[PDB]
Amino acid sequence: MDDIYKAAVEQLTEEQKNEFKAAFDIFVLGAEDGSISTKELGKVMRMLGQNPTPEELQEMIDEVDEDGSGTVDFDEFLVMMVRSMKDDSKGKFKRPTLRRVRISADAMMQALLGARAKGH
Ligand SMILES: Cc1cccc(Nc2ccccc2)c1
């Protein structure tokens, strides 16, 4: 979990984290635990035209998966959210978390966010 971004949620406005939450919640549409498992994650990706495999998906979850549960919950999602929209490490040091299927902040969000999305 990028503690830089982990601060950035601490740095996001109320609206900021509120919006992002929704995407989490809809990422977990009908989920029993309501945390994003790999196929919960994969759902949205396929909602975006992606077609991951859990392996890929897991590495996305694994970042913030502090409990080692294989599921992202809100703040876990949220820090990736601000991570996704910032990702300032363009041409310098960063560790690769599988450039397999990279979900875009808004593009992914919009898939869930047919409710308060910038687009639809
Ligand atoms: C490469 C990488 C690292 C961390 C997170 C994600 N994406 C993601 C998006 C939504 C839910 C879970 C994960 C991708």
Curated annotation (Swiss-Prot):
GO MF, one annotated term: protein homodimerization activity
GO terms of biological process kind: cardiac muscle contraction; diaphragm contraction; muscle filament sliding; regulation of ATP-dependent activity; regulation of muscle contraction; regulation of muscle filament sliding speed; response to metal ion; skeletal muscle contraction
Keywords: Acetylation, Calcium, Cardiomyopathy, Disease variant, Metal-binding, Muscle protein, Phosphoprotein, Repeat
One term under GO cellular component: cytosol
Effect of A8V: In CMH13; increases calcium sensitivity of the myofilaments
Entry keyword Phosphoprotein: yes
Its job: Troponin is the central regulatory protein of striated muscle contraction. Tn consists of three components: Tn-I which is the inhibitor of actomyosin ATPase, Tn-T which contains the binding site for tropomyosin and Tn-C. The binding of calcium to Tn-C abolishes the inhibitory action of Tn on actin filaments.
Disease: Cardiomyopathy, dilated, 1Z: A disorder characterized by ventricular dilation and impaired systolic function, resulting in congestive heart failure and arrhythmia. Patients are at risk of premature death.
The protein's name: Troponin C, slow skeletal and cardiac muscles
Organism: Homo sapiens (Human)
